Design a protein around this ligand. Structure first.
Ligand SMILES: NC(=O)c1ccc[n+]([C@@H]2O[C@H](COP(=O)([O-])OP(=O)(O)OC[C@H]3O[C@@H](n4cnc5c(N)ncnc54)[C@H](OP(=O)(O)O)[C@@H]3O)[C@@H](O)[C@H]2O)c1
Length: 315
């Protein structure tokens, strides 16, 4: 159906709306339009600096009775400067205040890397590199498990964890709640077959972020590759009378992945929803998988020496 069953018994909508880089001034309208169109899952984060304005839209639609809270699935993420056991709750309560909710459906550790606490999201060492915290992943997972026992979040997960870091949590002595979700970058140029196969075999649901290749990412140099413009993907979409974006959103769905395209444009938010009415053939799916080139949009390049940097491992 549009929902995948989580290990806590909840069902997660397979399509959600992303909000990274959605400006405060445009995201309230964008989330309102998305809920009107039929979106029931919104992906958020403290570091996107727009959760208050996302929260204005959810309140509006709740008040309107367009949707009840139980049918919404709201996701946010713990930023790297809040990995200390004593800061996790406070970070979650700030997000809950900004979103004006009393619980989150899913809360994710945004990156495995902890940074020193403070007001800068990427603290620098007077001079140059990002200043790390000495916290580790298991300390932060224990603080996340407390949030479930206190009723603030219904499920907890991870994002950008490689398979060894997931295995580290899965083997934690006294593990009380397994990660429900691992949210990772995934699209035809970074197909992630080994990490998806690992997670799915452990009962962890995978969410594909940057499904369209994030054409608005700030560091967009390469002058090269664009997924939306790839003539080979345009040809598959033409065969189905769909747009390239609709093919790129349908592709993770047929791999049993949740997918969270971002848009602040009403026509594209609506376009992106019309993805339940067609099917990519096996041939189309094998062809899209063959375009992998291990190209990653989000490589957290300022942290390549951090003890917990996730992308040195094969997967
Ligand atoms: N956990 C993490 O580390 C992490 C990292 C990155 C992203 N994410 C999540 O994943 C979400 C999606 O990834 P993303 O924001 O990197 O990028 P994306 O969804 O791959 O691409 C967004 C870009 O595509 C455009 N777009 C959307 N629909 C389109 C369509 N039908 N036709 C043409 N262009 C279209 C958007 O334009 P307009 O907005 O102008 O329409 C925007 O410029 C994020 O917003 C965030 O919620 C999570």
């Amino acid at each position: 159906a549009s929902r995948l069953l989580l290990n806590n018994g909840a069902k997660m909508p397979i399509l959600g709306l992303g909000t990274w880089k959605s400006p405060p001034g445009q995201v309230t309208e964008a989330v309102k339009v998305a809920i009107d169109v039929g979106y029931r899952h919104i992906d958020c984060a403290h570091v996107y600096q727009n959760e208050n304005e996302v929260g204005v839209a959810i309140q509006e639609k709740l008040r309107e009775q367009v949707v009840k809270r139980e049918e919404l699935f709201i996701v946010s993420k713990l930023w790297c400067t809040y990995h200390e056991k004593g800061l996790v709750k406070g970070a979650c309560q700030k997000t809950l205040s900004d979103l004006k909710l009393d619980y989150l459906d899913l809360y994710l550790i945004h990156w495995p890397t902890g940074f020193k606490p403070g007001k800068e999201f990427f603290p620098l060492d007077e001079s140059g590199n990002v200043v790390p915290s000495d916290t580790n992943i298991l300390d932060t997972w224990a603080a996340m498990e407390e949030l479930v026992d206190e009723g603030l979040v219904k499920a907890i997960g991870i994002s950008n964890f490689n398979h060894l870091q997931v295995e580290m949590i899965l083997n934690k002595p006294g593990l009380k709640y397994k990660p429900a979700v691992n949210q990772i970058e995934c699209h035809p140029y970074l197909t992630q077959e080994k990490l998806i196969q690992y997670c799915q075999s452990k009962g962890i649901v995978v969410t594909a972020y940057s499904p369209l290749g994030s054409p608005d990412r700030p560091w967009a140099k390469p002058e090269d590759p664009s997924l939306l413009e790839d003539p080979r993907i345009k040809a598959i979409a033409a065969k189905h009378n769909k747009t390239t974006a609709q093919v790129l959103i349908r592709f993770p769905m047929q791999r049993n992945l949740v997918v969270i395209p971002k848009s602040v444009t009403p026509e594209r938010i609506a376009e992106n929803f019309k993805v339940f009415d067609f099917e990519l053939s096996s041939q189309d799916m094998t062809t899209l998988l063959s375009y992998n080139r291990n190209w990653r949009v989000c490589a957290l390049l300022s942290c390549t020496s951090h003890k917990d940097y996730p992308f040195h491992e094969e997967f």
